[PDB]
Paper text:
Its active site is composed of a typical catalytic triad including Ser116, Asp 307, and His349 residues, similar to other serine hydrolases. The SAL crystal structure exhibited a typical α/β-hydrolase fold comprising a central twisted β-sheet flanked by α-helices on both sides.
An inactive Ser116 mutant with Ala substitution, which lost PNPB-hydrolyzing activity, was also constructed. The SAL–orlistat complex, which was isomorphous with native SAL, showed strong positive electron density maps of orlistat molecules near the active sites of chains A and B. The crystallization condition of the S116A mutant crystal was different than the native SAL crystal, with the former displaying a hexagonal system and with two molecules in the asymmetric unit. The S116A mutant crystal had a different crystallization condition than the native crystal, as shown by the distinct dimeric form. Wild-type S116A and S116A mutant differentially bound to fatty acids at the active site due to amino acid differences between Ser and Ala. The fatty acid bound in the S116A mutant was located on the short α-side chain and was almost 12 carbon atoms in length. The native and S116A mutant crystals did not use PEG under the crystallization condition or during cultivation or purification.
Author numbering:
A (entry chain A), B (entry chain B): 4 to 385
Write the structure that this text describes.
Amino acid sequence: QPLNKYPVVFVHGFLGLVGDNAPALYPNYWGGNKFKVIEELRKQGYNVHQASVSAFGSNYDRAVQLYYYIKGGRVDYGAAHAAKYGHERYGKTYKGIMPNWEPGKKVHLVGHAMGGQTIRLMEEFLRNGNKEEIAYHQAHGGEISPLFTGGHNNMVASITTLATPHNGSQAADKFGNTEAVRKIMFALNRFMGNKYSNIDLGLTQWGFKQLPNESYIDYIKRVSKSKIWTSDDNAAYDLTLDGSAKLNNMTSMNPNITYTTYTGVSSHTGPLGYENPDLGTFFLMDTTSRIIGHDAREEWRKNDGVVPVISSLHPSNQPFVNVTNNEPATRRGIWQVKPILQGWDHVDFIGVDFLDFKRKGSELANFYIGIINDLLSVEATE
Amino acid sequence: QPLNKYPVVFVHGFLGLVGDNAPALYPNYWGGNKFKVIEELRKQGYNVHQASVSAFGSNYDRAVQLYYYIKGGRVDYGAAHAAKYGHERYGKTYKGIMPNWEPGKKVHLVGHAMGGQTIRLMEEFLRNGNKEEIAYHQAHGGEISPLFTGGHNNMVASITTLATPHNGSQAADKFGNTEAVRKIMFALNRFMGNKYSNIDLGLTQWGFKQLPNESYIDYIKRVSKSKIWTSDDNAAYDLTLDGSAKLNNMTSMNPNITYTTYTGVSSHTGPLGYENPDLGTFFLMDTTSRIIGHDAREEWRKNDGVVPVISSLHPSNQPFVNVTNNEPATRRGIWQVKPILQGWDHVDFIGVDFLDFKRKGSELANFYIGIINDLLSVEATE
Ligand SMILES: CCCCCCCCCCCC(=O)O
Ligand SMILES: CCCCCCCCCCCC(=O)O
Ligand SMILES: CCCCCCCCCCCC(=O)O
Ligand SMILES: [Ca+2]
Ligand SMILES: [Ca+2]
Ligand SMILES: [Zn+2]
Ligand SMILES: [Zn+2]
């Protein structure tokens, strides 16, 4: 008899692993130890879920996977897409969080970081389809994912993003999308798809799963021919300013959806004008914070360690309204931009910063409850 | 050498009688006097037909009959179905419009009103079968109609509906499915199955045929014990909001079929905000128009006399795209919703409104030719 009418689905970001796909030393993504988001919200009688999608994949690959996580079924990336980039057309097959999902049965979407981008792309497919795949199916018949088809409306009540780089991050452009870092990440993925590998890093469609009677040397040889080593079809490219601007250019406001965003700052101004990470910013984003904070362009400097403020507030070409923290946030068709959370870094939003004693568990519980309240407001208006 | 590749089958709606089964004072269903649909389209060299199915029967009973009308053979409603509702398992036996019908030999389906529902249900059976009957045959052996079996694909090129209540009509809920009206309708059926009776109203499976040496009193007694008087297995129930929602919940898009719908409005806004029938709306639909037009929910008020606009556009849980009147309508797997025909009432689509001089015969000819053109477009793509 769950307290919320429409299921809330939490979508993780760029290096996210959840539930049983998360290795033992890797922290619990949604809330760390500070506030176990899924477990606690269920205990208070809300129907909430934790989507599991590709950790290194493109927003495209991930948006397809999100739909199959919700609906159930075998992941189909689309024949045209597959062919264009050089990966497998079909992926893993999900049970489904609601096999019933269709117009009239709504879902709430909350994304952390890249999850916010993934949410947006999935909804665009539901509503307007994918031109390229529709053309391809027109020519070559066969099957087509309903995701690619268009006309699916009233499937999502709300899109709410937490520290999402709507306008990219220069931490991707300057580090991270470089050949040097992509090669390291892809080797990790190669290794992690060995025949004994417990976990799945999200790039198995590119070949990164060792077959059962195939030697590790043969595996390496096979997969060295993959187009992944050079493709834009991966998270690192989508997180760049260009990548993210592409997503912005082909998404748009649903007049019926309730849009809302949150943002952290965790950097402070030096004498010069440039921006450095506060003590208490998760030490792993120290470098990225500095790259962003030392941008030539003043507006692009304040950041949460990994994504600049101007990127998190809203997609830049899409309509928005600044909103105070306690007003009901129930306005449809427009990005409702919440006040910047002072001293929250990128990862404070999900409570995994075990070193930050100044960001307490009860504060995190309030932030999440606060989101659930807003979702109830959406439910309670039409 | 008929100008269209696949035969076009016209399916009548709720009180429909065609060809030989239509009494002398009853109008010609497809086009009335304004445009003799079958005769004229044949004269222009198209292969077209007029299905004859039950006038008061459920979409189920009717969908079975439609299949046998096309294929030829003895109507089998299914043993499970029969047993569940309390009618005869086997009905009339049809010659067949194409005895060769099977995957690869396609047919165009155009339905007026309830005919649109019937089309959808028949195709669902072809493609996914009928669980209940499959299970029943699994347990008890014997025979099973190919209709109930599943796996039949490429049998229908197009589904096109004219003023079909995809989402029910409150003219069924509030008038029409009431005890009062059903009892009158079933008496009509009883009378019309008297031994000297020439026409079939579609409920003979329920007992409504007087036997050769049976008195009319004995007939009445027999048939008063029929489950019909209380069954959901009849047209009036299927036309309700619930009835129609049931159909929606167990049908789905065929990715390969070409779907297209037309809708009329024939009501205008009063001062209050409610919706009243235009002069020109057939007088018999004047009371139903008012019932729909006075709905508590504003969106459910505009109507064609007997079906609300929101009900005709598309099934509400299925994908759709608004389409202009001129561009080719060739998109597969999505409901292509034509612009609302201004001042067309429910029955203007079939030209039987002899009183409406503002809806011309040449206009009707253009509307029908327009449909045939679209069907040719479907033939000319894939
Ligand atoms: C394996 C190390 C790669 C680290 C590169 C940083 C890229 C910045 C993108 C931040 C977006 C997000 O948090 O989802
Ligand atoms: C005996 C008259 C009762 C008519 C009221 C029911 C209206 C249902 C919608 C019309 C659908 C159709 O024409 O097939
Ligand atoms: C004018 C007849 C007297 C009864 C008053 C109510 C209106 C009856 C019209 C019945 C509707 C119909 O025929 O479908
Ligand atoms: Ca912190
Ligand atoms: Ca009229
Ligand atoms: Zn891809
Ligand atoms: Zn029946």
